[PDB]
Design a protein around this ligand. Structure first.
Ligand SMILES: [Cu+2]
Ligand SMILES: [Cu+2]
Ligand SMILES: [Cu+2]
Lengths: 278, 78
């Protein structure tokens, strides 16, 4: 399985990815991914149990969630893998990502409604069913609530942080995980959600197919961080209330631990991932 | 100690807050009488389910951000 930069997909790969996503939507499978994500983001709390977000397991949890989704896509078309969106590189609304042959563009100013691409409400192929308000159409406001996506220099500053995570293992932490997640520092992952706007800014953010491409790049940055810091590993490593320790299993699956997900190459490789070096 | 309650009409909609599949909130917010899930972060900031990745300083600020996001739409209960 090779995960490729979205910017590099052929027209055939874009077609096949879109069709597979639309079939998971038609069959009812897609919406249950949105529902699972919303349940964890509404339940994960800084002072209590936290598994999907605001916690060290943010990265392995989303790695396994994306694996579940990719496997569902491959059950429809075995050639499809999740592409990733390097938002440090492809940082404008003119990016091919947002073209009508791929995800479609920004929403119109009146109501945020996306008007083009395969996921526009007018196609009849993308009802927003798992939602927090009456509106049933995909919405975006690219660059509306925050003006810029993270830059490569900002990403590199986060990648240079040596500790994976630190007590209190939540949104107040120092360390790589919370800086990548974005609750402290220059803010990588949370700011991208805010930049897309629409459902992507909400707990039901997998309603926008760009969710998967954003998280596939966050997941690639975890892999890059490991290559920069081969001496650093997941923490905590046992006996921490409310937090998933290294060898503890994770909900909702219950059968997989962070330890089983640290090495992505057991499941997929990237088009390019630099070797450890000085 | 929880924030104070509030009640106002913001952009034509009634927003209310009070101390009290989702976490066990110590504070409740309503938009036109429909509960809006909100959450407090460790640093004292707030988010809501319609603006989950963008902390704001207070539960009233989260309610106002939700009204701005909804653009007139009724909220659906969680
Ligand atoms: Cu998430
Ligand atoms: Cu996310
Ligand atoms: Cu070395």
């Amino acid at each position: 399985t090779v995960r490729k930069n979205q910017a590099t997909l052929t027209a055939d790969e874009k077609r096949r990815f879109v069709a597979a996503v639309l079939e998971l939507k038609r069959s009812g499978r897609y919406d249950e991914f949105v529902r699972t994500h919303n349940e964890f983001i509404m339940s994960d709390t800084d002072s209590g149990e936290r598994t999907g977000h605001r916690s060290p397991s943010f990265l392995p949890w989303h790695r396994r969630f994306l694996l579940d989704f990719e496997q569902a896509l491959q059950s429809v078309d075995s050639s499809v893998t999740l592409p990733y969106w390097d938002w440090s590189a492809d940082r404008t609304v003119r990016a091919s990502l947002w073209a009508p042959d791929f995800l479609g563009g920004t929403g119109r100013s009146t109501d945020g409604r996306v008007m083009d691409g395969p996921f526009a409400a007018s196609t009849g192929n993308w009802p927003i069913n798992v939602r927090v308000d009456s509106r049933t159409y995909l919405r975006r406001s690219l660059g509306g609530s925050v003006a810029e996506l993270p830059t490569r220099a900002e990403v590199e500053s986060v990648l240079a942080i040596s500790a994976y995570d630190l007590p209190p293992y939540n949104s107040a932490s120092e360390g790589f995980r919370n800086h990548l997640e974005g609750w402290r520092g220059v803010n990588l992952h949370n700011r991208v959600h805010v930049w897309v706007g629409g459902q992507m800014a909400t707990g039901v953010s997998p309603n926008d197919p760009v969710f998967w491409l954003h998280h596939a790049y966050v997941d690639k940055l975890w892999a890059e961080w490991q290559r920069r810091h081969p001496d650093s590993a997941y923490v905590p490593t046992g006996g921490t209330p409310d937090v998933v320790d290294l060898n503890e299993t994770m909900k909702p699956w219950n059968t997989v631990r962070p330890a089983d997900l640290l090495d992505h190459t057991a499941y997929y490789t990237f088009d390019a991932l630099e070797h450890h070096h000085h | 100690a929880a924030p104070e309650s509030f009640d106002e009409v913001y952009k034509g909609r009634r927003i209310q807050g009070r101390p009290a599949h989702e976490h066990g909130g110590g504070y409740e917010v309503f938009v036109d009488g429909v509960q809006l899930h909100v959450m407090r972060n460790a640093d004292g900031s707030w988010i809501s389910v319609v603006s989950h990745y963008d902390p704001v300083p207070t539960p009233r600020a989260a309610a106002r951000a939700a009204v701005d996001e909804l653009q007139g739409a009724p909220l659906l209960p969680f």
